[PDB]
Design an enzyme around this catalytic site. Structure first.
Site, PDB file in Angstrom:
ATOM      1  N   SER A 188       7.902  81.206  17.131  1.00 45.38           N
ATOM      2  CA  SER A 188       7.000  81.463  18.288  1.00 45.38           C
ATOM      3  C   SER A 188       7.688  81.275  19.649  1.00 45.38           C
ATOM      4  CB  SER A 188       5.818  80.494  18.315  1.00 45.38           C
ATOM      5  OG  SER A 188       4.928  80.866  17.262  1.00 45.38           O
ATOM      6  N   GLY A 189       7.421  82.116  20.614  1.00 39.59           N
ATOM      7  CA  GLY A 189       8.025  82.019  21.984  1.00 39.59           C
ATOM      8  C   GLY A 189       9.358  82.680  22.069  1.00 39.59           C
TER       9      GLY A 189
ATOM     10  N   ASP B 234      10.161  88.838   8.192  1.00 40.48           N
ATOM     11  CA  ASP B 234       9.187  88.644   9.316  1.00 40.48           C
ATOM     12  C   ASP B 234       9.610  87.429  10.128  1.00 40.48           C
ATOM     13  OD1 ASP B 234       5.556  87.981   9.254  1.00 40.48           O
ATOM     14  OD2 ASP B 234       6.713  88.802  10.841  1.00 40.48           O
ATOM     15  N   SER B 235       8.967  87.165  11.245  1.00 40.33           N
ATOM     16  CA  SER B 235       9.321  85.971  12.030  1.00 40.33           C
ATOM     17  C   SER B 235       8.263  84.990  11.411  1.00 40.33           C
ATOM     18  CB  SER B 235       9.119  86.218  13.585  1.00 40.33           C
ATOM     19  OG  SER B 235       7.884  86.885  13.763  1.00 40.33           O
TER      20      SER B 235
ATOM     21  N   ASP C 108      -0.398  85.961  25.785  1.00 38.74           N
ATOM     22  CA  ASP C 108       0.376  84.807  25.254  1.00 38.74           C
ATOM     23  C   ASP C 108       1.784  84.773  25.859  1.00 38.74           C
ATOM     24  OD1 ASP C 108       1.004  82.577  23.627  1.00 38.74           O
ATOM     25  OD2 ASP C 108       1.225  83.675  21.862  1.00 38.74           O
TER      26      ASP C 108
HETATM   27  N1  LIG Z   1       4.039  85.933  10.726  1.00 36.69           N
HETATM   28  C1  LIG Z   1       4.526  85.904  11.951  1.00 36.69           C
HETATM   29  N2  LIG Z   1       5.154  86.945  12.480  1.00 36.69           N
HETATM   30  C2  LIG Z   1       4.388  84.736  12.702  1.00 36.69           C
HETATM   31  C3  LIG Z   1       5.123  84.597  13.896  1.00 36.69           C
HETATM   32  C4  LIG Z   1       5.035  83.444  14.655  1.00 36.69           C
HETATM   33  C5  LIG Z   1       4.217  82.439  14.216  1.00 36.69           C
HETATM   34  N3  LIG Z   1       3.985  81.267  14.755  1.00 36.69           N
HETATM   35  C6  LIG Z   1       3.146  80.595  14.009  1.00 36.69           C
HETATM   36  C7  LIG Z   1       2.698  79.310  14.276  1.00 36.69           C
HETATM   37  C8  LIG Z   1       2.057  78.596  13.267  1.00 36.69           C
HETATM   38  C9  LIG Z   1       1.598  77.312  13.498  1.00 36.69           C
HETATM   39  C10 LIG Z   1       1.772  76.741  14.753  1.00 36.69           C
HETATM   40  C11 LIG Z   1       2.416  77.457  15.779  1.00 36.69           C
HETATM   41  C12 LIG Z   1       2.879  78.750  15.543  1.00 36.69           C
HETATM   42  O1  LIG Z   1       3.514  79.451  16.562  1.00 36.69           O
HETATM   43  C13 LIG Z   1       2.811  81.386  12.935  1.00 36.69           C
HETATM   44  C14 LIG Z   1       3.505  82.563  13.075  1.00 36.69           C
HETATM   45  C15 LIG Z   1       3.558  83.695  12.284  1.00 36.69           C
END
Ligand SMILES: NC(=[NH2+])c1ccc2[nH]c(-c3ccccc3O)cc2c1
Ligand SMILES: [Ca+2]
Ligand SMILES: [Cl-]
Length: 223
Positions: A177-178, A171-172, A84
């Site tokens: 994301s990214g 948490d993130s 990813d």
């Molecule tokens: N719990 C985590 N550490 C986490 C981190 C990044 C995430 N991104 C996403 C996400 C959810 C819906 C659409 C795009 C996403 O990147 C969930 C999600 C959960």
């Protein structure tokens, strides 16, 4: 970021916001013309916003540059999220200064227990959606591979690592994301996925950047 704190304006100068009329993913500036983000954040029409703190107010220091091309890793699997990672080349180079700066790629992978800084404008609630205006920060440790595989049996590949708190609360989350996972001044991870956000025993999973440095370098050298 759930359970984190306000970073403070421009204290994370390599953080970028990917924008298509709203903030949808974060990213990291690694040189003046390239950004690294997650492959699942790919879409056409990306405008990269650098020097941001409040993403809804132009406060000064912002540089908005269009993406010239986005390169998703060729072996990216959208069902397992393995590989990813994505590179975005900017249409013009950014002006680097103290508020906009790039982050270094690692020369070695980080060990369990390393403390890292994760940041982003993602959701701040584990149960519900509250999106912030300014950048949030969270300090979190890399967990051991045994605790990670025990939390997500059969879903962790060697290109992933877990970071976070098993007790839940920090948490993130979606919107992060990214974005960057920086440990000792080096970019070691990219926010990738997790089960819900800040749930007990379900830590965040991140793309292991040390496994992609030769790929990032060869790809940038040829584009
Ligand atoms: N719990 C985590 N550490 C986490 C981190 C990044 C995430 N991104 C996403 C996400 C959810 C819906 C659409 C795009 C996403 O990147 C969930 C999600 C959960
Ligand atoms: Ca702004
Ligand atoms: Cl396993």
């Amino acid at each position: 970021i759930v359970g984190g704190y306000t970073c403070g304006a421009n204290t994370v100068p390599y953080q970028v916001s990917l924008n298509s009329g709203y903030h949808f993913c974060g990213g990291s500036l690694i040189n003046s013309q390239w950004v690294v983000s997650a492959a699942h954040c790919y879409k056409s029409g990306i405008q990269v916003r650098l020097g941001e703190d409040n993403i809804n107010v132009v406060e000064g220091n912002e540089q908005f540059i269009s993406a010239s091309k986005s390169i998703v890793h060729p072996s990216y699997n959208s069902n397992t999220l393995n590989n990813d990672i994505m590179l975005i080349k900017l249409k013009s180079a950014a002006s680097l200064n103290s508020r906009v700066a790039s982050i270094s790629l690692p020369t070695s992978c980080a060990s369990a227990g390393t403390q890292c800084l994760i940041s982003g404008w993602g959701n701040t609630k584990s149960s519900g959606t509250s999106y912030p205006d300014v950048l949030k920060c969270l300090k979190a440790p890399i967990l051991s591979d045994s605790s990670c595989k025990s939390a997500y049996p059969g879903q962790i590949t060697s290109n992933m690592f877990c970071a976070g708190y098993l007790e839940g609360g920090k948490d993130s989350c979606q919107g992060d994301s990214g974005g960057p996972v920086v440990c000792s001044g080096k970019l070691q991870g990219i926010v990738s996925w997790g089960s819900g956000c800040a749930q007990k025993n379900k830590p965040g999973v991140y793309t292991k950047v040390c496994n992609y440095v030769s790929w990032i370098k060869q790809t940038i050298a040829s584009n």
